[PDB]
Amino acid sequence: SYPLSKFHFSVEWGGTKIGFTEVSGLDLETEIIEYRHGASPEYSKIKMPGMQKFSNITLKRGTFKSDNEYFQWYNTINLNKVERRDLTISLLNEEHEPVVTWKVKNAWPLKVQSTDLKGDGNEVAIESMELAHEGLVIQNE
Amino acid sequence: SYPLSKFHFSVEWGGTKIGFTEVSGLDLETEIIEYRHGASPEYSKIKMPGMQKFSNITLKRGTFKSDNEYFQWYNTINLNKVERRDLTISLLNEEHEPVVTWKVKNAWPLKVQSTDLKGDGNEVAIESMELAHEGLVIQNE
Amino acid sequence: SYPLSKFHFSVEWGGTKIGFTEVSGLDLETEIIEYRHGASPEYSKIKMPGMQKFSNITLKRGTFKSDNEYFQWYNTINLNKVERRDLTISLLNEEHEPVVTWKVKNAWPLKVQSTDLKGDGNEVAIESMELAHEGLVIQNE
Amino acid sequence: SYPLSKFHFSVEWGGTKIGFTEVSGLDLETEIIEYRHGASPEYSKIKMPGMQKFSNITLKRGTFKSDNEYFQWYNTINLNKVERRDLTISLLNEEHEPVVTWKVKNAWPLKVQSTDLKGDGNEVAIESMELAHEGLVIQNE
Amino acid sequence: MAEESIKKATEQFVFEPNDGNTWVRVRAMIENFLILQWRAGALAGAKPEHAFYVKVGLGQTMTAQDILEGNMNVEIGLAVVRPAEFIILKFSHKMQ
Amino acid sequence: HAFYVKVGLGQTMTAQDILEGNMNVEIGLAVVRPAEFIILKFSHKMQ
Amino acid sequence: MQVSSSFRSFLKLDILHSYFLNDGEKDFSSMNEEESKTQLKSYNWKDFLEIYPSQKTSHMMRGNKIFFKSFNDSIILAIKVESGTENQPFNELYEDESMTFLLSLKDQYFGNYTDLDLADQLLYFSNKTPVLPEAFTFKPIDRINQSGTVGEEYLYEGENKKHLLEEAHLNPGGGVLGIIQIYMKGDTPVLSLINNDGTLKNSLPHFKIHFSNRKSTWKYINLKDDFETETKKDYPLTKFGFILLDKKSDFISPPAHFEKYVFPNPDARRIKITPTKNYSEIFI
Amino acid sequence: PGGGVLGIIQIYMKGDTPVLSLINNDGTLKNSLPHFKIHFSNRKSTWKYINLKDDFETETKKDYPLTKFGFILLDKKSDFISPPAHFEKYVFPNPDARRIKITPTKNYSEIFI
Amino acid sequence: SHMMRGNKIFFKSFNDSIILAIKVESGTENQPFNELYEDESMTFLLSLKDQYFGNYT
Amino acid sequence: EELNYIWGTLGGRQYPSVFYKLNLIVIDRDATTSEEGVITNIHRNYETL
Amino acid sequence: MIFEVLKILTDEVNQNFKGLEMEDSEVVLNNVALIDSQQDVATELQNKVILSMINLREEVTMKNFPNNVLEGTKVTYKNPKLNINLFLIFCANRTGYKKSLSDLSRILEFFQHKSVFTQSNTSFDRDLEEMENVKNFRFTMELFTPTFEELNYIWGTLGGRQYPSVFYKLNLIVIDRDATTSEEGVITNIHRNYETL
Amino acid sequence: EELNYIWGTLGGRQYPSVFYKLNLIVIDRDATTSEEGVITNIHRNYETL
Amino acid sequence: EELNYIWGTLGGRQYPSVFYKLNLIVIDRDATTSEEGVITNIHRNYETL
């Protein structure tokens, strides 16, 4: 058929703007359990799945005037309480409709990083955020 | 709209001059607490926010005649005493007015680094300072 | 064939909740009676079974708002009387059904241990209980 | 539902300050009385509750200029007399209100331990106290 | 109880475009709710796949006529646990 | 929830203040109040 | 178990400001259809104003199934209706029910370009005459087909101000520009939302709020040539328009070499306001 | 219970007539492989062309079929109802099958220029 | 599926068609290995994957 | 190194020059692809699975 | 299919200039490297926009796909298909420098609005004799902007004197002879033999 | 490597040469954008929140 | 970068082109250097060290 490209995408996160520059960290991983008893004629181990793990998601975008959304979400931490959100990330075709969707439950931010300030170059300001979550389901149909 | 650039900025630190070359280390981070009991049908953990952390800020500028400000602040350390200052860092527009401001409380210096001396190159002298602090608030409105 | 894992289980103890983070002490033990008479050709002793013993059972879990159950059971002790309960511990399959069951007769709380407190400690408050009992039967069919 | 953390708490002990870095020893314990008669079909013993016990409570904090309170309370001991106090320990919520309270009857200072000194040691001077008491009640409503 | 929560989830789209972007968001919101109810033990089933289903979209719940009228159709199923009412104890002599 | 501070054109100042040379600062504070009267009510326990 | 619902428009409000919509001397209100559309494409009321319901209003709206939607030039409320019809509210509405919305500003230069004397006063709009402790006059929120802009007729002070702020139960931090209060039944049929039998009206009520822009004398300063000059008449401040000044006759005491000079239009960031004329200083 | 079924196909070893059966009377497989067919038809519609910049609309005179790979050339003024003043400079694309208005009479496909 | 396993009937597919095949007795072309009866039947289900099927069909 | 790249595509013989960087020219045809109506009716169906 | 795809693309840009009532702008397929060669080709290039092909690549994700056909009880064997990406340039060579900058805006505006091209989309003449081999196609256009080091590489192979230009990347031309190598019959008899070892 | 870059933009045929680096030419138009008066009155308002 | 290297040694003005890689031309003169006879007798001598 025709392979998909990765430069057209959108993110629904509960803010005003959905345009970002990069997304990373959409992975699934299971730990392994191994076993051997002494009477086996093979001298290697047998393997089983065990407990599951999820990794943190990083989002990056540019800095604009009168948009303090990153800091407003991070400011809802009060001792053990936070505002948890659903996160929907889609890969789009040429008529801007979803093709592959990543569905994330119970997300909250743990790290907010601002831009660094340099005098000599010509560069725009990028801000970054890291999210913790409790599960991910991939839909491609 | 139009994205912001990162080469026009100012720092209010209690000294005479406000022009610097680079700023880094303006971050926020929260540690994580995890939990699972044995009867849960999901085989992964649930996540909460816990204690908070701040990272050190680095400032760099050039070396000039009759300006020993870095060493004068570092020389106020007497056993457990130091002069703590407020720090205000702003990103400026084309008419030199603030747009994004980082507000820092209770800062004091812990490392002062001088330039290295080399004979063969053509290079100016840069001095650097590292600061410890107790909190940061971002204002963009 | 593969062995069973040890992280999916439940405990029925006469309380509101069945989830725990740790269970230990499900042991069985007997005494040995030794004998030798002077005319024996062997210089070792002959052994036979003595009286039976059981170990105490330890249960641990996190603390929650408004759940004061460990204290309420303990507080039923009145001189030589106490509320005794049947304790059922079960290791579960993928359908969340029992596979291996440990049946415990007449349990009662010897000791209740509360959470320690640390100004700089990032963690979950854990509470624990130690139970006396009069017998253990193991079922695996 | 999420469990409570263990780093935000306060202690009321009849002193000027309520902040501590560590609290430990909030335990409850009872004795076991065992019995068997010769004709029983079982070769194990029957168990019932005995007398009650309590553990000593340890409190730690840093030292401050002009705060000589640990020594002043200890110094109220005069042969068989001592000033006894009601000790209240509380685990706090995000509004800084009590959630779980430990109520302790008749406490008095057994031991006061001062700070060690090191020529090359970079750290806070810590002092500690060990308290005797006559009873503990746990409230979580 | 389940209806109150689901209703709030779909009311957020009263004057939104009726297209694929909406259908995906609506479905994701509903499933996350139901997964949590399953995790807490409200629903039967070894995995969420056996506890419930949600369907939204052209070709599943909608046709061309619904796009024209401005309708959005959401279909939901749930596996709900039932109680025991009668316990019967049968007694006999042991043979031996 | 404890305090607020407001300074600036459009918040505390207008064009007239810029012209005159004024600076207006607005501050609010949440201050704690004491208990004065403790009332103890006694009764017989019913049982 | 089948569940169904249906929603219909309940009330529309038009939010305009001349600073962003006019083009130099050309008044938005006198533009033709293509001209009007063109100007609207660059306008968004949320660039300067923030609008939201009071806590009591939010509670009521939830109970009565009333929703709040917004567009770059307007606000539309929508209501749940009975299945099978177009005009019967699901829940019965009563004549004295009302909704209260608050206005606040985000644009720090609003006061420089907006021609309204807001010093120490509350701006108030409604479709029903209030009952206040001191004598006052009253005019309603204007309809979409009426002329005019926001003026002094909508400002309150003293005890009347205090009274209105208290009834609306506002937060101690203040920062309120004004209050908008709409009743289901107003002082006349053309301002009401419903008919006598509770039926929704068959013509959507359509109200308007429009702010005017400030004018000033332009002063040009040339330090290197050491000369100053002023225009003869005031010109409007606008965001996107342009006024060309190119005749000696346009100025009071024009320079000797006028033909080589260019005269830029002023911004609205700095302005001198006096009881008579306003002034804008421009450096060359 | 999840449904989602379009239809059901049921084949019996012995049908209502010999030509629809799989086997003979003695159980022997037939000597001519049974060969059945299912064929779906395609929908037709009126094409409407919308030109916003020139502010004009036009429609074709007769319905045309929707297909995935074919192409219909429309190039005469006579093909249209109320064709534009400068028809000679315009190109009229064929519609997709992603959006269509279905009514009891005609179906319509809207195409923007 | 259960019946097809029992009677040795297989399901194959091509871009324009479906063909079923059956095990036969060794040495011949037309005798099914297992006896078939007149009222036995096979049921197949149809479902759609193309979301636009209803617009063009 | 960058001056060698720039004058390598202009001939190879430099002249006195300054370089500038211009920001944000907006290119947009502003044409319409489609029009549709918004959601006004919601129906929910429940079954016991 | 290289010439036929680029000839179709040349007609779509020329149709867009016609709808805007611009009678001076026309795109021509030739090579940019001979603009100032001064040998018999440069007279065709004057006062025109020139479209050229500068590079060829191969799509890697589809390289190991098979291409056999099954029908009845018979299989035919074929070689796997070749898939090719292109890199293109639009080079404006008008008499006035101001006119070249106006044509480059129109080309940037055209591909901003329409990026997918099919056999049903386009308006090329199907009856033409040179286009008798084309049946079904689909390709996308995507804007490509190089760095200063990459521009030095590109114009280093075209002369060393740049012109106002834009660069594009074309996706998936399919090249396939569709010839048969072999035919065989499928498996219809299975025999199994067992022995005690 | 640097000599190849420098003479690559000057023709490609070197001559006997020395190179120097000059420090700090100041470029400034020294024009006025605005004039304002300084702070002379301060007012503070307190409320119990 | 590779196209710039290839056309840099062919003139600097490219043409429409495709590139191919050919495998295994064998070059061998097949001449004799020496001839000898193989091992046919083996002798072993042992001593006590």
CA distance K39 to K37: 6
D111 closest CA partner among D30, D7, D19, D25: D25
Sequential DSSP letters for I12-54: EEETTEEEEEE-B-TT-SS-BSSPP-TT-EEEEEE----TTHH
Tell me the two tokens of residue C34. Answer: 């030794």
Helix (H) or strand (E) holding F27: strand F22-29
Binary contact (B30, A67; C-beta < 8 A):
no
Tell me the two tokens of residue B98. Answer: 């603030």
Binary contact (A51, C7; C-beta < 8 A):
yes
**Taking the mean position of all CA atoms in its chain, how far away is CA D29?**
14
Output Rg (C-alpha) for chain F, integer angstroms: 25
Tell me the two tokens of residue D140. Answer: 């979580």
Q: In a mutagenesis test of the D interface, which of B48, B53, B77, B110 is the best target, namely the one with the most D β-carbons within 10 Å?
A: B48
Resolution in A: 2.5
CA distance A50 to A31: 5
| Contact (Cβ atoms closer than 8 angstroms) between residue B13 and residue B85 | yes
The nearest alpha carbon in chain G to F28 belongs to G173
Task: State the structure-solving technique.
Answer: cryo-EM
Per this entry, what is the length of chain K?
Answer: 197
CA distance H55 to A130: 50
Other CB atoms within a 10 A radius of the CB of residue D68 amount to 10
Chains in contact with B, where contact requires at least 3 CB pairs less than 8 Å apart: A, C, D, E
Helix (H) or strand (E) holding F29: strand F22-29
SS3 content of chain E, % helix, strand, coil (to 5): 40, 20, 40
Tell me phi and psi for residue F4, to 5 degrees.
-145, 155
Residue G199 DSSP label: P
Helix (H) or strand (E) holding H109: strand H107-112
The nearest alpha carbon in chain J to K156 belongs to J9
The three-class DSSP label of residue K11 is helix
| Largest CA-CA distance found in chain J, in angstroms, rounded | 82
Helices E20-39 & E2-11 angle (0-180, nearest 10): 160
Does any CB of chain H come closer than 8 Å to the CB of residue J46?
no
Residues 6+ apart with CB under 8 A from B10: B18, B19, B89, B90, B92
Burial degree of K164 (CB within 10 A; 0-12, 13-18, 19+): middle
Helix (H) or strand (E) holding E20: helix E20-39
Does any CB of chain G come closer than 8 Å to the CB of residue L17?
no
Helix (H) or strand (E) holding J4: helix J2-8
| Contact (Cβ atoms closer than 8 angstroms) between residue G111 and residue F15 | yes
Nearest to F10 among G105, G172, G173 (CB): G105
Query: Chain E to chain J, count of Cβ pairs less than 8 Å apart?
Result: 68
**Which residues are bridge partners to D103 per DSSP?**
D88, D137
Touch criterion met for I and M (3+ Cβ pairs within 8 Å): no
The three-class DSSP label of residue G39 is helix
Helix (H) or strand (E) holding E5: helix E2-11
Q: In a mutagenesis test of the K interface, which of J1, J2, J9 is the best target, namely the one with the most K β-carbons within 10 Å?
A: J9
Other CB atoms within a 10 A radius of the CB of residue J24 amount to 7
Give me the helices (H) in G33-109, please: 33-40, 55-64
CA distance G207 to G127: 10
> Measured between beta carbons, which residues in chain A are less than 8 angstroms from residue E32?
86, 103, 105-106
Nearest-neighbour CA in chain C from D129: distance (Å): 15
The single residue listed with the structure tokens 């959100």 is: A85
**Which residues are bridge partners to A48 per DSSP?**
A33
Tell me how far CA of residue K136 lies from CA of K57, K117, K125, in angstroms. Answer: 22, 11, 15
CA distance A101 to L4: 53
Tell me how far CA of residue G283 lies from CA of F16, G280, H19, in angstroms. Answer: 22, 10, 100
CA distance E18 to J41: 11
Report which residue type is found at D64: F
Tell me the two tokens of residue B93. Answer: 């527009």
CA distance I25 to G64: 77
Helices K97-113 & K2-19 angle (0-180, nearest 10): 110
Tell me how far CA of residue B112 lies from CA of B59, B74, B115, B125, H108, in angstroms. Answer: 10, 8, 10, 14, 76
CA distance L44 to L34: 28
> Measured between beta carbons, which residues in chain A are less than 8 angstroms from residue K115?
94
Binary contact (A94, K59; C-beta < 8 A):
no
CA distance C131 to C13: 11
Does any CB of chain H come closer than 8 Å to the CB of residue K15?
yes
Tell me the two tokens of residue E3. Answer: 């209806």
CA distance G54 to G102: 7
The three-class DSSP label of residue E68 is helix
Other CB atoms within a 10 A radius of the CB of residue B1 amount to 10
Per this entry, what is the length of chain G?
Answer: 284
Nearest to G272 among F8, F14, F19 (CB): F19
Does any CB of chain J come closer than 8 Å to the CB of residue E71?
yes
**Which residues are bridge partners to C33 per DSSP?**
C48
Residues 6+ apart with CB under 8 A from K137: K1, K5, K8, K117, K118, K119, K174
CA distance A110 to A82: 10
Binary contact (K59, A3; C-beta < 8 A):
yes
CA distance G166 to G171: 10
Residues 6+ apart with CB under 8 A from M43: none
Binary contact (A63, B3; C-beta < 8 A):
yes
Binary contact (G67, E3; C-beta < 8 A):
no
The three-class DSSP label of residue D128 is strand
Helices and strands of chain C, counted as H and E runs: 1, 10
Distance in angstroms between the alpha carbons of the first and the last residue of chain K: 61
Tell me phi and psi for residue E36, to 5 degrees.
-60, -40
Nearest-neighbour CA in chain C from B4: distance (Å): 38
Q: In a mutagenesis test of the H interface, which of J30, J32, J49 is the best target, namely the one with the most H β-carbons within 10 Å?
A: J32
| Contact (Cβ atoms closer than 8 angstroms) between residue C113 and residue C127 | yes
CA distance K165 to K107: 10
CA distance G142 to G191: 9
CA distance I44 to G146: 69
Other CB atoms within a 10 A radius of the CB of residue K93 amount to 19
Q: Which 3-state string (H, E, C) describes C7-33?
A: CCEEEECCCCCCCCCEEECCCEEEEEE
**Sequence-ordered strand ranges (E) for D37-135:** 46-54, 57-62, 85-92, 98-113, 126-132
**Which residues are bridge partners to H60 per DSSP?**
H80
G174 closest CA partner among G161, G155, G191, G189: G161
The nearest alpha carbon in chain E to A135 belongs to E32
| K61-90 as b/e: b if 16+ CB within 10 A | ebeeeeeeeeeeeeeeebeeeebbebbbbb
The three-class DSSP label of residue L4 is helix
Interface of E to G at Cβ within 8 Å reads 3, 7, 11, 14-15
**Which residues are bridge partners to G206 per DSSP?**
G12
> Measured between beta carbons, which residues in chain G are less than 8 angstroms from residue L31?
223, 283
Residues 6+ apart with CB under 8 A from A130: A56, A57, A58, A109, A110, A111
Give me the helices (H) in chain B, please: 69-74
G8 closest CA partner among G105, G85, G99: G85
To 10 degrees, the CA torsion angle through K27, K32, K35, K37? -150
Sequential DSSP letters for A10-73: EEESSSS----SEEE----EEEEEEE--TT-SSSS-EEEEEEEE---EEEEEE--TT--HHHHH
Binary contact (E14, G3; C-beta < 8 A):
no
K165 closest CA partner among K107, K82, K85: K107
CA distance E56 to E75: 7
Burial degree of K52 (CB within 10 A; 0-12, 13-18, 19+): buried
Binary contact (G7, J40; C-beta < 8 A):
yes
| Contact (Cβ atoms closer than 8 angstroms) between residue K158 and residue M8 | no
CA distance K154 to G5: 62
CA distance C126 to C70: 12
Binary contact (D7, C64; C-beta < 8 A):
no
Instruction: Please name the residues between 35 and 54 in chain I that touch chain E, using a CB distance below 8 Å.
Output: 48, 50-54
CA distance K125 to K117: 15
Strands G278-283 and G215-222: parallel
**Taking the mean position of all CA atoms in its chain, how far away is CA D99?**
18
**Sequence-ordered strand ranges (E) for B8-125:** 9-12, 22-24, 27-35, 46-53, 57-62, 85-92, 98-113
CA distance C77 to C82: 4
Tell me phi and psi for residue G192, to 5 degrees.
-90, 160
The three-class DSSP label of residue G160 is helix
CA distance I27 to G124: 101
The nearest alpha carbon in chain J to L2 belongs to J1
Segment G47-50 long-range contacts (CB within 8 Å, at least 24 positions apart): G47/G20, G47/G107, G48/G17, G48/G105, G48/G106, G48/G107, G48/G110, G49/G15, G49/G103, G49/G104, G49/G105, G49/G106, G49/G107, G49/G177, G50/G103, G50/G104, G50/G105, G50/G106
Residue G224 DSSP label: T
Nearest-neighbour CA in chain H from I35: distance (Å): 7
CA distance C44 to B86: 84
A140 closest CA partner among A13, A26, A17, A56: A26
CA distance G110 to G115: 9
A139, HSE (Cβ side, Cα atoms, 13 Å): 15
Residue H20 DSSP label: G
Tell me the two tokens of residue I48. Answer: 């759609």
Does any CB of chain C come closer than 8 Å to the CB of residue D123?
no
Tell me the two tokens of residue D19. Answer: 């902040």
Q: Which 3-state string (H, E, C) describes A86-128?
A: EEEEEEECCCCCEEEEEEEEEEEEEEEECCCEECCCCCECEEE
> Measured between beta carbons, which residues in chain E are less than 8 angstroms from residue B42?
39
Chains in contact with K, where contact requires at least 3 CB pairs less than 8 Å apart: A, H, J, M
Per this entry, what is the length of chain F?
Answer: 47
The three-class DSSP label of residue E92 is coil
| Contact (Cβ atoms closer than 8 angstroms) between residue A138 and residue A123 | no
Tell me the two tokens of residue B44. Answer: 């992964």
In sign, the C-alpha dihedral spanning G264, G267, G272, G273 is positive
> Measured between beta carbons, which residues in chain H are less than 8 angstroms from residue E64?
100-102
The three-class DSSP label of residue B121 is coil
| Contact (Cβ atoms closer than 8 angstroms) between residue A59 and residue A48 | no
CA distance D54 to E24: 60
CA distance G166 to G159: 11
K5, HSE (Cβ side, Cα atoms, 13 Å): 23
CA distance L43 to F26: 9
Report which residue type is found at K3: F
Report which residue type is found at M3: L
Residues 6+ apart with CB under 8 A from G53: G61, G68, G99, G100, G101, G102
SS3 content of chain K, % helix, strand, coil (to 5): 25, 30, 40
> Measured between beta carbons, which residues in chain H are less than 8 angstroms from residue J31?
52, 112
Does any CB of chain L come closer than 8 Å to the CB of residue G172?
yes
The three-class DSSP label of residue G189 is helix
Helix (H) or strand (E) holding D71: helix D69-74
| Contact (Cβ atoms closer than 8 angstroms) between residue B13 and residue A134 | no
Nearest-neighbour CA in chain B from A80: distance (Å): 5
> Measured between beta carbons, which residues in chain E are less than 8 angstroms from residue I53?
59
CA distance B136 to A114: 12
Instruction: Please name the residues between 54 and 93 in chain H that touch chain E, using a CB distance below 8 Å.
Output: none
Sequential DSSP letters for M1-49: -HHHHHHHTTTSB--S--------------------PPP----------
Tell me how far CA of residue G161 lies from CA of G123, G132, G155, in angstroms. Answer: 9, 9, 9
E2 closest CA partner among E59, E46, E49, E51: E51
Helix (H) or strand (E) holding G178: strand G178-183
Per this entry, what is the length of chain A?
Answer: 141
> Measured between beta carbons, which residues in chain K are less than 8 angstroms from residue J10?
161-162
